[PDB]
Symmetry: D3
């Protein structure tokens, strides 16, 4: 995940940040205080950016030609995942955070299949 390569990767890193994104979006419906809303927006932006970075590192550093060969939809899925995270940044609606998580979940299934044997 660090590009040594160390060969340690886990889509859980991207998932956990994306789970924070959604958690924040949900908290934003419960407290209309301007200061709270602003801190939530600041922190959402950061966690969504870290999520994007973890997704991108998987795609660049972990996934290799035989994976792209076996999963020809994987390039586009990764791109759709990043754009869903951007749409989450730009939105207070938890449905957008959830969409990002659903995409990451497709990445995680593919990841673990490639880790098998």
């Amino acid at each position: 995940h660090c590009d040594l390569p160390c060969g340690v990767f886990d889509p859980a890193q991207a998932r956990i940040e994306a789970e924070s994104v959604k958690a924040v979006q949900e908290k934003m419906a419960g407290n209309d205080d301007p200061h709270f809303q602003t801190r939530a927006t600041v922190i959402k932006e950061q966690r969504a950016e870290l999520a994007k970075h973890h997704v991108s590192v998987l795609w660049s550093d972990y996934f290799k030609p035989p994976h792209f060969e076996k999963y020809p939809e994987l390039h586009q899925l990764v791109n759709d995942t990043l754009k869903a995270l951007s749409a989450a940044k730009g939105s207070k609606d938890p449905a957008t955070g959830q969409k990002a998580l659903d995409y990451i979940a497709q990445i995680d299934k593919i990841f673990w299949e490639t880790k098998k044997a």
Copy 2:
């Protein structure tokens, strides 16, 4: 974990980073090229620091006074965990990586108990 509070924590964040530290240590044992050794040292330093931040965060942002009362040894455990990580930082021996992982696993145990 982002201090909103957002309420999402998982010691897996510390864990995966400390696993990377150990993995890098293991690889340093295999290949003595100076350039590689240096890159491994750079990376190990980053990963260990990240792991420390995650551990420090659980301690300050997740754990609360009722937990420190029920687990009177938790402050020292977290301190020892951070010191273990500093020691893995300073070392190429994967056993130091593993010691940090062992301490993290003690924290994870407590963490999931408090989730019940």
Copy 3:
């Protein structure tokens, strides 16, 4: 402070960042411009976060088991200081920035004693 170890520590690093937090809280009371309010919120989150990092570093990298023996309340003190910094992140009230300073002043008092003996 850099974990080499280099042996250069000073709670002044935590203190100056916590002073910035309090000073930003004080400025927010003087200008209701929503853009200023938002920038102040961005800056206060960052500074408070750096203050927490400096405080954690002292506890993990400077203080050692004999210090914890001699000051059995140091563990809880450091935890309280970080929670006070998080409470100031979440607030516009300078009294919260002050409270974080109060705790930092207690750590600073212990620190300099350990530099004597």
Copy 4:
């Protein structure tokens, strides 16, 4: 490039970092001092990582479905560019930096065609 979106992007950001990567690799053949070699390796790693981040941001934030439609090789080219930057990180040979630059150059031509009308 910041994901507002601000709509300001330029592959020159990724190019300039990748030009530093190569410059460092070339400087590494001229001075065998261990300390110099170490600082060069440290700085190479950083600039290659920033290059990767600029390439990834183009792919995720600037490029859109009609671009991927018109350039069906663009996903793979971006992936090859990132791996070339990783191979540059892992290498003292300026030919690896140059390969990363040749890839970025293909991205830059495509970028500017999509910016036309």
Copy 5:
């Protein structure tokens, strides 16, 4: 620009970041949604800070005493440029973004003269 020295500099790094500042200012004028305004404010602050770092770097790491002698006004220009960027940070008016861009263009002019 990375302090090796690597010898690669281009005021385009400051420029593109300051162009992003101005672009964000322009967009703030178009859409008064609070969430959007906040995100624009977050981003503008980051981009402006990055631009400052690039400018400060040219000044310390690229420019040398012979340049400061040939261009006695360069120290003040760079200082003014950083202050312009701080002012764009504090403002939603794209004219402040443009002022910072104008100062950067003065630096770029001098920079390319010294490359000849």
Copy 6:
């Protein structure tokens, strides 16, 4: 120091980071372990870089045109300090860390005068 402006500045931030630089240079003379030498090199690059940021910040965000009028050599002084910090990044010799400190001490002297009048 955070560009709000918040009005909290102290050259002690630059000073403590430059002390770390010098202290790391001194440690490198005491332990020839190649792994230690490399970590010391990593840490010294980072600390020196933070010191340069703190020095630049004072010059850009704290000092103002009347200060530059009263101290016409302040511009060159700040430039010299940053070049001295870069020279210490590039060196193992503590004399270079010391020189960076010497310059910082001169800025600190001017700073506190401007806090009086």
